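In practice, a research group might receive sequence data for several interacting partners and want a quick structural hypothesis before committing to experiments. The following worked case mirrors that situation: the sequences arrive first, and a predicted assembly follows.
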Amino acid sequence: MNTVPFTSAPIEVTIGIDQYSFNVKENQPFHGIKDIPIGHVHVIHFQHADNSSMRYGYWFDCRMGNFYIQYDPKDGLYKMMEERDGAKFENIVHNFKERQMMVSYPKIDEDDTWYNLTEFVQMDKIRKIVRKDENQFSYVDSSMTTVQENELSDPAHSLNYTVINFKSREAIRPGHEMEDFLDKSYYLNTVMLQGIFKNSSNYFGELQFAFLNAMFFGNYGSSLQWHAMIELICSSATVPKHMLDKLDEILYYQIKTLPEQYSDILLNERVWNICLYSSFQKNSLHNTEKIMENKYPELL
Amino acid sequence: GAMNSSNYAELFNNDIKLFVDDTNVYRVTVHKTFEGNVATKAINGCIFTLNPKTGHLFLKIIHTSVWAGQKRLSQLAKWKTAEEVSALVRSLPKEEQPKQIIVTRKAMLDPLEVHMLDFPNIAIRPTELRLPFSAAMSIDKLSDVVMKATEPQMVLFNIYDDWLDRISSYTAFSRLTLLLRALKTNEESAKMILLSDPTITIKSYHLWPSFTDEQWITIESQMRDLILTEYGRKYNVNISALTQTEIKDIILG
Ligand SMILES: CCOC(=O)c1cn[nH]c1C(F)(F)F
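A structural hypothesis for the assembly, expressed as tokens:
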């Protein structure tokens, strides 16, 4: 079980760790998060009490290094850092645990929620979508734009999601205009799966990572990407049975976890109505259709 | 964005543009079967592709053979329209290619945009204007070339005959839309007005009769009366009670 210590908490902040969160007061003796489950990526995240515009966080995997948080009073944020000295790090963590200054990652034994949301999400793939090669962890915030959003400005601070555009030469073979526009199977199976992602696991990873950045940071471009990746599957007549069954599980857990009060901003009425009621796959997403109809019948 | 009453003069500027109307592409007669079911029988159709500045009409005749063994024909008709418009643009020399294509029906936007991906600098626009181009098949010579076709054919016309010798494009378009609106509202009455006086003929190389400037004023008035006469018998409105400002509005409306 791994640990992300904090040097201190000089400003009042709501701290998220995956789907959990807790309030820390200004100068509260808080020194970090322990018992973090090994085997999954994690996201620590922050919303300052004095300024909710400051909404930002770090994707990391404790298997890749020893990470800590330190407040920077100049840039006015909690920064993730790597400690390269294993023995110093162990010595710091041991002291804070002895003085019980750390909150425990509050996982219920029964509860597969985080696994179900991050099944296909890999740190190596996050580090390609979020490009900062000197760090093993990835910074995301509410304002960061996507490569596709920047085409329609600063490229070093962008989310390099795979561009999906239904009215693009990539999506439409010359001479198959109607066929490829009305049935996106070509674009899904040949261009995206075989061509770009290589497999359905990389496609699901991105999709899951887009959702989590939409949910945890209110990142609008991430929400666009999540919906585009759902729509591209739902709008394809020919999808492998294993991919449809898996998509149903992925979307079920995403809809399960979504805070009820953010459903209005985080769900696109057109995509969900098309996917569940109009599309080729309208009858392929049983679990997702049932949770959507019971939790958000107004959107539909 | 959208082509409306606000930006109407744009039609007659020196930027090449085409209207595309797909109303007459897929045409059927609905009939009873021997077992008392209903069936359709397709008849020849046409794409109406018009340069509003020059009057050049690219009439692509859609032969019923296009539909053989196809499903969802009303959907296919939009994509076939978009295919044939994109083929027409590719056939034109670069200096003749349009800078904009205005579709009369919003359902043509996606099909045309997808077929024209190769032409990112050609704007595909809807219009708020309710244009009467469906009535093209009430022009006898256009109806005749469509119904005689035994194969796919493109036929080139000037829908303004020689009017641009005497009037501006703006006035020519206004005359065309009034004639087509009348033909669309009451075909029999409109044809009567156009062809009653047998001394005024249609030249072999023209679509409409050879009216003098004064005769066009009388014809234009007779068409405007017909559109109000019909808008009267439609809504049960005493038209003789209407003033000139409220008359003006209803042809536009
Ligand atoms: C580079 C596209 O992303 C992926 O292929 C992938 C595969 N597992 N996780 C990803 C993520 F997180 F980067 F989206």
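Before designing any experiment, note the following. Chain A touches chain B at residues 167-169, 172, 177-178, 181-182 (CB under 8 Å). The pocket of T9Y is lined by residues A 120-122, 125-126, 128-129, 197, 202, 205-206, 209 (CB under 6 Å).
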